[PDB]
């Protein structure tokens, strides 16, 4: 709903989406290969 959102904010006024009460699969985002950049700090994209 965020990554495929049809509209993003102007960066000076960037939006903040609250994700809670859900199951978070990040391997589906990482390995979609739709991203040019997917840099996770500390913990790798598929370990988090």
């Amino acid at each position: 709903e965020v990554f495929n959102a049809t509209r993003f904010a102007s960066v000076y006024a960037w939006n903040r989406k609250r994700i809670s009460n859900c199951v978070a699969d990040y391997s589906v985002l990482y390995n979609s290969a739709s991203f040019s950049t997917f840099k996770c700090y500390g913990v790798s994209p598929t370990k988090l």
Binding site: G42, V43, S44, K47
Partner: protein
Amino acid sequence: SNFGAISSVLNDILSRLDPPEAEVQIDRLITGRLQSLQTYVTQQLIRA
């Protein structure tokens, strides 16, 4: 104590980080814990 480490707990390092960094955080904890044991023993020898 962390002794410069991100966490006093080995598993907060190992379950999150790849070895190139996890080992660094562990050496910081080893140094601290090893020093604690060495200090302890020296004191035990003196009172002995």
